[PDB]
Each structure stands twice: as structure tokens, then as C-alpha cells.
């Protein structure tokens, strides 16, 4: 099955076991992404992964790809990782009022699972995740995704200033053009807040 880090101690333990000896250029590429992912990801989504449209992003995107495509840059274990998203992840016809007074709109929810449940998709941008469920504010956001990441999947773990401008996020960065299958889209009640959240189970292929 998949490893799940439940606390700081487990996440740090697992972190130390991950590859960290990137080159200066590779670290700067990874760290640059963490400063603001928007110019990478928006450009990649807008141009369907074609780089020639803008020489400046082409160069940055190829440098990051190289760091993440490196031989050692991969996950040893099966591991579960997490991210939160706003409702428009499912399309610009949705916004965050889909949750009203801690309740998910059932009509809109059913349209979303009708459209995306069971869907295999390729992400043109990179995928930022955390190995800790609490480590973003992914519990705050309307949509929470669990990615089941199989051993050998390429990526970079970042939790220190040489690799990220935001240390303490326990980040696992996955390469661009990652293919995943949405296994399940469902609703769950947070026990602490007592509000509904849309939950997504995706498997990295």
C-alpha cells in the first residue's frame, strides 16, 4: 500500500531518505519555481506544453525538467501526497460559493463527478504537493486531492531554503506532463470544522 506521513517526525524521517544532491543550476531551477509557480504553470496550460511561444519560459521550463528528469530524482516508496484547490480546478463555471454554509452544492457536485470521476488526464503544468495533510491550508480549500504516487515516480522533495523559498511546506514537486487517473470524487465532513469538502482520489500513472 502507500506510505502516509501523519506528523512532522514521520515527514522529516521520510524527507532525509530522499535524493538531495542536485546541481547548483538544478536547485536554482527548483527554487525559482517555488517563488511563484504561476508563470510556469499558466504558460504550460495556455500553450498545451509547447515552449517555443516564449523563449524565456522555454529556458526555465527545460532547466527544471532536467532537474526533475534526473536519474536519482524519484520517489523510492509508494506514497500519498496532498494538495488543496479552489473550485475552478473543475472549470471556470465553478467558484468557491459551491460550498455555502459548509455544505457542498449537490447539483454542482454531481456535474463535477459526472464530468471528472474516472477521468485520466495529463497535467501540462507541474504538480506541487505536500507529504503532510496539514502542511498547506489544503484542509481550508474547497477541494482536497490525494495523489497516490507509485515508487519510481520522478520528482523533488523540498523542505529547506536551498530548494524552496518556502521551507516548512514538506513539498513533493512532480514533473510536468504527469498523467493521473481520478479514481473517486466524493464529499467528506471535516470532524474539526464540521463543514463539507470535495475530496479527490487520484493515482499517478
Amino acid at each position: 500500500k502507500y506510505k502516509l506521513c501523519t506528523n512532522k517526525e514521520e515527514a522529516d524521517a521520510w524527507g532525509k531518505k530522499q535524493f538531495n544532491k542536485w546541481s547548483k543550476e538544478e536547485k536554482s531551477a527548483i527554487r525559482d519555481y517555488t517563488k511563484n509557480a504561476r508563470p510556469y504553470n499558466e504558460f504550460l496550460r495556455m500553450h498545451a506544453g509547447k515552449l517555443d511561444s516564449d523563449p524565456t519560459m522555454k529556458k526555465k521550463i527545460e532547466s527544471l525538467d532536467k532537474a526533475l528528469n534526473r536519474k536519482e530524482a524519484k520517489v523510492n516508496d509508494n506514497i500519498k501526497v496532498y494538495r488543496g484547490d479552489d473550485a475552478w480546478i473543475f472549470g471556470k463555471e465553478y467558484d468557491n460559493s459551491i460550498i455555502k454554509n459548509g455544505k457542498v452544492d449537490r447539483e454542482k457536485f454531481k456535474e463535477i463527478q459526472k464530468k471528472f470521476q474516472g477521468k485520466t488526464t495529463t497535467e501540462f503544468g507541474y504538480i506541487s504537493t505536500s507529504i503532510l495533510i496539514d502542511a498547506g491550508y489544503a484542509k481550508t480549500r474547497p477541494v482536497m486531492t490525494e495523489f497516490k504516487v507509485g515508487s519510481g515516480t520522478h520528482g523533488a522533495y523540498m523542505n529547506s531554503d536551498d530548494l524552496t523559498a518556502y521551507p516548512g511546506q514538506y513539498e513533493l514537486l512532480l514533473p510536468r506532463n504527469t498523467v493521473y487517473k481520478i479514481e473517486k470524487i466524493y464529499i467528506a465532513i471535516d470532524n474539526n470544522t464540521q463543514k463539507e469538502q470535495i475530496k479527490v482520489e487520484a493515482t499517478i500513472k
Binding site: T34, K35, D95, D134, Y137, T140, P167, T193
Partner: protein, 176 residues
């Protein structure tokens, strides 16, 4: 060159919109993120270039348990309230100050009054008066800042952009 800023304050007091507008996006009308993703701000003050990593937080009490994960190694705190919410100002000394002083001991604080555009807004005046309140006056913000030992007090409007660059300039001066 590299510093860390964390922004805190009551739910809905304008934290995320302030970060978004500082990033030079338009004020968000339809698609309002709950928490803004990673964004390092490039700021120059007094001949020094700074890369200020901005950490957004969820202000609601429901997420109190999560917020401490944002606090370590912070160089400056933006502690916010809304000028249209005297209640949000009262939570400055009651909630935010004790929290920040516990997790970020002796880290500089900028006290920030958000939604300055609502001070001279009729709807705001009329709604507030129904509960015998009025918009926070600048003097009251200043007094609170003195009372909590803030570096300074700033007012801004994400909606109009008024004061937004000045907030982040002062934060950078406090971070240095």
C-alpha cells in the same frame, strides 16, 4: 536579501485580496482564493533589494491548529483587521497578539487596517450604526499599534490599491 512575512487576522478581513493586489493582479471579483499560493515579492527600500516570501493564512478559528505550521523563522508579521469591522480590531489584542507573540516571540509586527475604502462608505456606516459601531478611525488603529508594540501602523485598500505598496515597503523595512 531573503525574508519571510506571514499575514494574519480575522476571517474575511482582506488578507488574500491584499496579497493578490500586491502581486499586481486586479482586485478579485468572482474567483477569490481562500489562501494565496506561493509568491515572493521583490521589494527595494533604502538601497537594499529584498525577496519577501509572503505566507497567507486562514483567519478562522476553525484553522487555529494549522496556523502554527506557517510561523517558524518569520522576519515580519502583517497583523490585519478591517476598517469596516471594529470587532476585527478587538480581536487584535484578544487573539492575534497573544498568538503571534507565543509562536513568533519578538518578531516585528506591522498593524494593518484593511478595506480603507470603506471608512467613507455609506452602506458600511449604516450597517455598522445598526450595532452602535462606526468605521475604525485612524487614531484607534494607531493607538492599538502602540498598545501592542508594533513597528508601525498602516492603512490600505486592496480594492483601490491605496496604501498597498506602502504596507509592503514598511514590512520590508521591519524585516531588515
Amino acid at each position: 536579501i531573503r525574508k519571510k512575512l506571514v499575514i494574519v487576522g480575522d476571517g474575511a478581513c482582506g488578507k488574500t485580496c491584499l496579497l493578490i493586489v500586491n502581486s499586481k493582479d486586479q482586485f478579485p471579483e468572482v474567483y477569490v482564493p481562500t489562501v494565496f499560493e506561493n509568491y515572493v515579492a521583490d521589494i527595494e527600500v533604502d538601497g537594499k533589494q529584498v525577496e519577501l516570501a509572503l505566507w497567507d493564512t486562514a483567519g478562522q478559528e476553525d484553522y487555529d491548529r494549522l496556523r502554527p505550521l506557517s510561523y517558524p523563522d518569520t522576519d515580519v508579521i502583517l497583523m490585519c483587521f478591517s476598517i469596516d469591522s471594529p470587532d476585527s480590531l478587538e480581536n487584535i489584542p484578544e487573539k492575534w497578539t497573544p498568538e503571534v507573540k507565543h509562536f513568533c516571540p519578538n518578531v516585528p509586527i506591522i498593524l494593518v487596517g484593511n478595506k480603507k475604502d470603506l471608512r467613507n462608505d455609506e452602506h458600511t456606516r449604516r450597517e455598522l450604526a445598526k450595532m452602535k459601531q462606526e468605521p475604525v478611525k485612524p487614531e484607534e488603529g494607531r493607538d492599538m499599534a502602540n498598545r501592542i508594540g508594533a513597528f508601525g501602523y498602516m492603512e490600505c485598500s486592496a480594492k483601490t490599491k491605496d496604501g498597498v505598496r506602502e504596507v509592503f515597503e514598511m514590512a520590508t523595512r521591519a524585516a531588515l
